[PDB]
Amino acid sequence: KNLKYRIYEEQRVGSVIARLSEDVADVLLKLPNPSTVRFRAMQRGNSPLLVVNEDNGEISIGATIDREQLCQKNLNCSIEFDVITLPTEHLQLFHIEVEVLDINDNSPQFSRSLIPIEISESAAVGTRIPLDSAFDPDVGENSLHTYSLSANDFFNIEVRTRTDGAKYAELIVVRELDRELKSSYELQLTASDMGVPQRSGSSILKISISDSNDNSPAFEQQSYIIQLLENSPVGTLLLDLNATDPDEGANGKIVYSFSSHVSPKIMETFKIDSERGHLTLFKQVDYEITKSYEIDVQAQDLGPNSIPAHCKIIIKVVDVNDNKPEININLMSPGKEEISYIFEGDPIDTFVALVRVQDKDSGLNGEIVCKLHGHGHFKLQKTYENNYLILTNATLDREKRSEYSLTVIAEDRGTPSLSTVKHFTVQI
Amino acid sequence: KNLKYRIYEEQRVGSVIARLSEDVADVLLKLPNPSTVRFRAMQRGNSPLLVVNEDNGEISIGATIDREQLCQKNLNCSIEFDVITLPTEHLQLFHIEVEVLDINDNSPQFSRSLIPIEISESAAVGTRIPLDSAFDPDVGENSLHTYSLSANDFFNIEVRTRTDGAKYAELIVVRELDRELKSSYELQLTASDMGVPQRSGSSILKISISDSNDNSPAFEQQSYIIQLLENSPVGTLLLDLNATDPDEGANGKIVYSFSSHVSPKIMETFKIDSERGHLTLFKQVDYEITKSYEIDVQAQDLGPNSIPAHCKIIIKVVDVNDNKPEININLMSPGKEEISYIFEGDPIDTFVALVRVQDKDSGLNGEIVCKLHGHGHFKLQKTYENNYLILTNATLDREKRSEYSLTVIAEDRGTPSLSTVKHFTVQI
Ligand SMILES: *[C@@H]1O[C@H](CO[C@@H]2O[C@@H](C)[C@@H](O)[C@@H](O)[C@@H]2O)[C@@H](O[C@@H]2O[C@H](CO)[C@@H](O[C@@H]3O[C@H](CO[C@H]4O[C@H](CO)[C@@H](O)[C@H](O)[C@@H]4O)[C@@H](O)[C@H](O[C@H]4O[C@H](CO)[C@@H](O)[C@H](O)[C@@H]4O)[C@@H]3O)[C@H](O)[C@H]2NC(C)=O)[C@H](O)[C@H]1NC(C)=O
Ligand SMILES: *[C@@H]1O[C@H](CO[C@@H]2O[C@@H](C)[C@@H](O)[C@@H](O)[C@@H]2O)[C@@H](O[C@@H]2O[C@H](CO)[C@@H](O[C@@H]3O[C@H](CO)[C@@H](O)[C@H](O)[C@@H]3O)[C@H](O)[C@H]2NC(C)=O)[C@H](O)[C@H]1NC(C)=O
Ligand SMILES: *[C@@H]1O[C@H](CO[C@@H]2O[C@@H](C)[C@@H](O)[C@@H](O)[C@@H]2O)[C@@H](O[C@@H]2O[C@H](CO)[C@@H](O)[C@H](O)[C@H]2NC(C)=O)[C@H](O)[C@H]1NC(C)=O
Ligand SMILES: *[C@@H]1O[C@H](CO)[C@@H](O)[C@H](O[C@@H]2O[C@@H](C)[C@@H](O)[C@@H](O)[C@@H]2O)[C@H]1NC(C)=O
Ligand SMILES: *[C@@H]1O[C@H](CO)[C@@H](O)[C@H](O)[C@H]1NC(C)=O
Ligand SMILES: *[C@@H]1O[C@H](CO)[C@@H](O)[C@H](O)[C@H]1NC(C)=O
Ligand SMILES: [Ca+2]
Ligand SMILES: [Ca+2]
Ligand SMILES: [Ca+2]
Ligand SMILES: [Ca+2]
Ligand SMILES: [Ca+2]
Ligand SMILES: [Ca+2]
Ligand SMILES: [Ca+2]
Ligand SMILES: [Ca+2]
Ligand SMILES: [Ca+2]
Ligand SMILES: [Ca+2]
Numbered sequence: 001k002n003l004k005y006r007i008y009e010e011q012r013v014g015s016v017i018a019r020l021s022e023d024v025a026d027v028l029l030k031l032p033n034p035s036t037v038r039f040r041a042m043q044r045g046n047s048p049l050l051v052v053n054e055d056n057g058e059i060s061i062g063a064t065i066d067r068e069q070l071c072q073k074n075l076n077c078s079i080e081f082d083v084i085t086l087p088t089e090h091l092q093l094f095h096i097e098v099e100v101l102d103i104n105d106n107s108p109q110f111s112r113s114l115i116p117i118e119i120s121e122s123a124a125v126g127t128r129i130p131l132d133s134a135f136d137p138d139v140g141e142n143s144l145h146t147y148s149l150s151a152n153d154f155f156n157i158e159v160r161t162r163t164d165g166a167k168y169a170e171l172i173v174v175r176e177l178d179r180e181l182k183s184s185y186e187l188q189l190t191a192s193d194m195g196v197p198q199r200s201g202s203s204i205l206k207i208s209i210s211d212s213n214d215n216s217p218a219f220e221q222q223s224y225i226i227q228l229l230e231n232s233p234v235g236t237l238l239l240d241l242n243a244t245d246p247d248e249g250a251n252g253k254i255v256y257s258f259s260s261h262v263s264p265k266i267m268e269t270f271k272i273d274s275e276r277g278h279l280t281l282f283k284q285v286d287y288e289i290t291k292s293y294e295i296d297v298q299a300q301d302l303g304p305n306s307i308p309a310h311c312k313i314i315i316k317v318v319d320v321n322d323n324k325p326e327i328n329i330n331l332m333s334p335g336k337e338e339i340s341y342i343f344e345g346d347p348i349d350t351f352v353a354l355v356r357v358q359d360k361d362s363g364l365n366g367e368i369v370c371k372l373h374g375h376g377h378f379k380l381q382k383t384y385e386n387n388y389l390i391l392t393n394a395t396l397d398r399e400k401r402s403e404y405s406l407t408v409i410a411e412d413r414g415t416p417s418l419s420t421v422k423h424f425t426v427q428i
Numbered sequence: 429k430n431l432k433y434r435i436y437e438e439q440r441v442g443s444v445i446a447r448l449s450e451d452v453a454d455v456l457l458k459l460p461n462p463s464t465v466r467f468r469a470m471q472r473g474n475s476p477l478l479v480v481n482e483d484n485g486e487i488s489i490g491a492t493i494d495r496e497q498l499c500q501k502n503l504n505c506s507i508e509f510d511v512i513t514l515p516t517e518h519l520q521l522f523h524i525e526v527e528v529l530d531i532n533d534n535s536p537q538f539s540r541s542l543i544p545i546e547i548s549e550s551a552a553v554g555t556r557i558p559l560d561s562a563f564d565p566d567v568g569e570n571s572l573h574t575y576s577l578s579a580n581d582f583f584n585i586e587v588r589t590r591t592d593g594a595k596y597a598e599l600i601v602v603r604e605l606d607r608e609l610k611s612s613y614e615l616q617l618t619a620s621d622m623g624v625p626q627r628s629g630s631s632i633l634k635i636s637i638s639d640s641n642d643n644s645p646a647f648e649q650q651s652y653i654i655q656l657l658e659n660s661p662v663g664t665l666l667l668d669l670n671a672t673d674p675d676e677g678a679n680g681k682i683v684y685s686f687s688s689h690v691s692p693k694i695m696e697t698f699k700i701d702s703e704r705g706h707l708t709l710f711k712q713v714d715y716e717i718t719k720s721y722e723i724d725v726q727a728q729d730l731g732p733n734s735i736p737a738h739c740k741i742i743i744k745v746v747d748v749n750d751n752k753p754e755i756n757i758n759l760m761s762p763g764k765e766e767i768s769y770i771f772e773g774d775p776i777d778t779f780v781a782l783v784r785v786q787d788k789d790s791g792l793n794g795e796i797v798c799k800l801h802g803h804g805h806f807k808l809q810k811t812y813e814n815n816y817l818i819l820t821n822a823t824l825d826r827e828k829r830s831e832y833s834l835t836v837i838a839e840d841r842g843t844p845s846l847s848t849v850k851h852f853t854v855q856i
C-alpha cells in the first residue's frame with residue numbers, strides 16, 4: 001500500500017510522523033495473529049532519516065532532514081521510505097512518501113562583505129551598474145525577495161529579475177557626480193526574503209569616483225600690465241604666472257606656453273617656463289625701436305579633450321637716458337670743417353655755422369640745452385627747436401688774432417645727464 | 429620761411445619736386461641782385477635722399493624714397509631739411525618739410541607658410557582659434573584689411589582687430605567634427621589689403637583632428653546561447669568573442685573580462701582571454717549539479733571616461749550518460765549477503781529479496797532495465813518504478829540443490845550503456 005505524509009524540515013530527531021497501526025489498520029488487523037507482526041525498514045545503515053519501530057510501527061525522524069541539502073531549489077521535495085511487515089509469509093509492503101516543506105532557516109547572504117565598484121564622475125545621470133546578487137537557498141516566500149540601499153543623495157537601486165527568475169539589484173546614478181567635491185562613498189546594500197521570521201543579509205559597497213578632465217586651468221587674473229626699463233638684463237623675471245586645475249594627475253598638471261598665434265618677434269625677446277610659468281626676458285629691449293608688447297599666454301593641462309585658459313600681458317617699455325645728444329655743425333664751405341672768414345674784417349651778425357642737435361630718447365632725456373663756449377664773443381641764436389645759428393656779436397680785429405677755437409656743448413636734461421662737445425676753428 | 433610739399437614714395441630718381449626760386453620769390457626779389465642768389469642744402473645724416481640745384485633751387489630726388497624704411501608703420505611721414513641762400517649777406521633760411529605718401533608696393537605676408545593646428549574632435553561647435561596675423565608694411569588702406577578662408581563645410585573665419593589696430597583671423601568650428609571619418613583638413617587662408625591694385629598673400633592651414641574616446645566597444649550580438657556537453661574537456665573553446673572600437677590608440681584597445689558582479693562560481697569554472705576574447709572552460713561541468721549558466725561578460729577600452737560594452741552568454745549544459753545504475757538489495761539476513769530461506773518446502777511467490785535501482789542521469793541515460801540471472805526458477809517481479817521483488821517460482825524441492833547464487837543486472841538505456849551487477853546466494 002502507498003502512504004503519503006507531509007512534514008516540515010529540520011524537525012527534532014525522534015518526532016513521529018505517523019503510526020502504521022493507526023493509518024493502515026485495514027491491513028494490519030487482517031493478518032494472521034495481528035498483534036505478533038513486526039516491522040522492518042528498507043534502507044542502508046549510513047544516514048537513515050526515517051526509522052520504523054519494529055514493535056509498534058512508529059515512523060519517526062532518525063536523522064535531521066535539511067530540505068536545502070536534499071532538494072536544493074526545487075519546489076517539490078519528498079523522501080521515499082519502504083517498510084515491510086514480518087514475518088515473510090504474506091508480508092505487506094508499505095511505500096511511504098513524505099513531502100518535505102521548507103522553513104526559513106537561511107538568510108540572504110552576499111559572496112563578499114566589501115563590494116568595490118568604481119564610477120567615473122563623467123557617468124551620466126541614468127548610468128546603471130548591476131550589483132552582486134545575494135544567495136538564499138530557501139524557496140518560495142522564504143527565498144530572496146527584495147533589496148534596499150542606505151539613504152543617500154546620489155544613488156538609488158532598482159530591483160530586477162534576470163532570465164532564470166532570480167532577483168538582483170541595479171545601482172542607478174541619480175545625481176551628477178563630481179570627484180572634485182566628493183571622491184568616495186560607502187553605502188549598505190541589504191537583501192531580505194519574505195519568510196516568517198523575516199531574514200536579512202547585507203554587504204557594503206565602497207564606491208570610488210575616478211577623476212575625469214572636467215576642469216581646465218584658471219588664471220588669477222586675465223590681464224597684466226608690466227613696466228620694463230629698456231636696460232634690464234637678459235633673464236629679468238617679468239612675471240610669475242600661477243594657474244590652477246582641480247583635476248587629478250595629468251588632468252590637473254598644467255603646461256604654460258605662448259599662445260600658438262604669437263608673432264615671432266615676441267618669441268625672440270621673451271621666454272616662458274613651461275612648468276612654473278616664469279615669463280623672463282631673452283634678449284634686451286630698446287625703447288627707441290618698439291615701445292610696447294602685447295603677449296598672449298596660454299595654460300593647458302595634459303589631459304584629454306583639454307580646453308586651455310589664456311591671459312594677456314602688456315609689457316610697456318619705459319625710456320632711459322641711454323643715448324647721448326648729437327651735434328652737427330654745417331657750413332657754407334663745400335669742403336671741410338673750417339669756417340673761412342674774410343681776411344680784412346667783417347660785419348656784425350654774420351653767418352658762421354648752422355648747428356643742429358638731436359637726442360634719440362624722449363621726454364627730458366631727449367630735451368637738449370645747447371651752449372656756445374668759444375674763446376671770444378660769438379652768439380648762439382636759436383632759429384627753431386633744436387636748431388640754432390652761430391653768429392658774431394661785435395666787430396672783429398684781424399691784426400690781434402687770426403685763429404679762433406669754438407666749442408659747442410650739447411647736454412640733455414636727463415639724470416644722469418649726458419652731453420657731447422664738438423670743436424671747430426675760425427680762420428680769418 | 430616754412431615750405432611744405434607732398435610727394436609719393438619710390439618716385440623715379442632725379443625727378444624734380446619743387447622750385448625754390450619760384451616758391452620763395454617773395455623773399456628773393458627783395459634782395460640785391462635776385463638773379464645771382466645760389467642755394468645750398470643743409471643735408472644731415474648719412475641719408476642723401478634729396479638734392480638742391482645750387483643755381484635755380486630745384487629740389488630733386490637724389491635717392492629712392494621708400495616710405496617703409498623711413499617711418500615704418502607711422503601715418504605721418506616727412507623729411508625735414510634746411511636750405512640757405514648765398515651769398516651770406518643777409519642769407520635766408522628755408523625749412524622744408526616733404527611729406528612722403530605711401531603706395532601699395534607691399535603685399536600681405538605670413539611668417540610661416542604652413543600653419544599646423546591641432547583640434548580634438550570633441551571640440552564643440554563654437555570653438556575659436558585665433559590664427560597667425562599677416563604683416564603688411566604698407567599704411568592706411570594699403571595695409572592688411574581682410575582675410576578669407578578656402579570654402580569648406582566644417583570651418584568658418586571671423587576677422588578681428590586688436591588693441592593697436594592690426595587685424596587677425598579667428599578660426600571657428602561651425603559643424604561637429606568626427607575624426608573616425610575625416611582625420612585632417614587642409615585649408616587656404618588669404619590675407620588681403622584694401623589698396624588698388626589689391627594685393628594678397630596666403631598661407632595654408634594643416635588642421636589635424638586628434639582622436640577623443642567618443643566610441644565604446646561593440647559586440648556582434650547582445651546575447652549568445654551555448655550548448656555544452658557536460659563531459660567536455662577542460663579548455664574547450666566555448667566562444668570566441670569579437671568586439672570592435674573605431675577609436676585610435678588606447679581609446680580603441682579593448683579588454684575583455686567578466687563583469688565585476690559575476691558570482692565566484694562562474695569565475696571558478698570559466699576563463700576569458702583579456703586580449704582576444706577566448707571564452708574557455710576552466711573546470712569541467714556536471715549536468716547533475718548545475719544545468720545552466722548566465723555569464724555576463726564585458727569589454728571596455730583603455731581610454732578615459734570609458735563606458736563598457738556587455739554581452740550575455742547562456743550556457744545550457746546537456747546530460748550525458750556518465751553515471752552507472754546503482755543497485756540496493758535488501759534481505760532478511762542482518763549479517764552478510766546470504767538470504768536464509770525457509771528450510772521446509774515453501775509456496776510459490778515467497779519473499780526472497782527487495783531490490784531498488786536508481787540512476788543519477790536523466791532521460792534514457794537514467795532509465796534502467798533490471799534483469800535477474802541465476803541458476804534457476806526465480807522471478808523478478810516489479811512493484812513500482814525501479815523497485816522490484818525477488819520471489820520464488822516453483823516448489824522448493826530441497827533435494828535438487830541447496831545453494832543458489834543469484835546475480836542482478838542493472839543496465840541503463842543510455843548510449844554508451846552503463847551497467848552494475850550484484851551477487852548474493854540463497855541457501856535453503
Ligand atoms: C570572431 O572572429 C573570428 C575570426 O574570423 C576572422 O576575423 C577577422 C580577423 C576577419 O578576418 C574576419 O573576416 C574573419 O571572420 C571568427 O572565427 C572564424 O570562424 C570561421 C568559421 O566561422 C573559421 O573558419 C574555419 O576555420 C577552421 C580552421 O581553420 C583556421 O584554423 C587553422 C588552424 O589554426 C588555421 O591554420 C587556418 O588558417 C584558419 O585560420 C576550418 O577547419 C573550417 O573549415 C570547415 O568549416 C568551413 C565553414 O566554417 C567549411 O566551409 C569547410 O568545408 C570545413 O568544413 C573553417 O574554414 C575561422 O577559422 C575562424 N577564425 C578564427 C577563430 O580566428 C568568428 O566566427 C568570429 N565570431 C565569433 C562569434 O566567433
Ligand atoms: C605665483 O606664486 C608665487 C609663489 O607664491 C607662494 O606659492 C604659491 C604656490 C601660493 O601658495 C602662494 O600663496 C604663495 O605665497 C608668487 O611668488 C611670491 O611672491 C611674493 C610677493 O608677492 C614673495 O614674497 C615677497 O617678496 C618680497 C621681495 O623679497 C618681499 O619684500 C615681501 O615682503 C614678500 O616676502 C614670495 O617670496 C614669492 N614666492 C617665492 C617662492 O619666491 C608669485 O608672486 C605668484 N604670481 C603672481 C602673478 O602673483
Ligand atoms: C511538482 O508538484 C506538482 C504538484 O502536484 C503534486 O500533487 C501530489 C500528487 C504530490 O505529487 C505532491 O508532491 C505535489 O504537490 C506536480 O503536479 C502534478 O504532476 C503530475 C505528473 O507529473 C500530474 O499528473 C498532475 O496532474 C500534476 N498535478 C496538478 C495539480 O497539476 C508536478 O508534476 C511536480 N513536478 C515535478 C518535477 O516533480
Ligand atoms: C651781444 O651784443 C649785445 C649788444 O647790446 C650785448 O648786450 C651782449 O652782451 C650782454 O649785454 C650787455 C648789455 C652787457 O651787459 C654784456 O656784459 C652782456 O654780456 C652781447 N652778447 C655776447 C654773448 O657777446
Ligand atoms: C598726421 O596727418 C593727419 C592727417 O591724416 C593729421 O590730422 C595730423 O595732424 C598729422 N599728425 C600730427 C600733426 O601729429
Ligand atoms: C515461472 O513459472 C511459471 C510456471 O509455468 C511460468 O509460466 C513462468 O514463465 C516462470 N517465470 C518466468 C519469468 O518465466
Ligand atoms: Ca534547512
Ligand atoms: Ca529552509
Ligand atoms: Ca531565506
Ligand atoms: Ca568634477
Ligand atoms: Ca584639468
Ligand atoms: Ca575632475
Ligand atoms: Ca635704447
Ligand atoms: Ca632711450
Ligand atoms: Ca639723451
Ligand atoms: Ca616702399
Ligand SMILES: [Ca+2]
Nearest residue numbers: 530531533566
Ligand atoms: Ca609702401
Ligand SMILES: [Ca+2]
Nearest residue numbers: 534566570621
Ligand atoms: Ca599692402
Ligand SMILES: [Ca+2]
Nearest residue numbers: 606607608642
Ligand atoms: Ca567621432
Ligand SMILES: [Ca+2]
Nearest residue numbers: 639640642675
Ligand atoms: Ca574617436
Ligand SMILES: [Ca+2]
Nearest residue numbers: 643675679729
Ligand atoms: Ca573607444
Ligand SMILES: [Ca+2]
Nearest residue numbers: 714715716750
Ligand atoms: Ca555528470
Ligand SMILES: [Ca+2]
Nearest residue numbers: 747748750789
Ligand atoms: Ca549525466
Ligand SMILES: [Ca+2]
Nearest residue numbers: 751789793840
Ligand atoms: Ca546512467
Ligand code: NA
Nearest residue numbers: 241242276277
Ligand atoms: Na607660476
Ligand code: NA
Nearest residue numbers: 669670704705
Ligand atoms: Na575574438
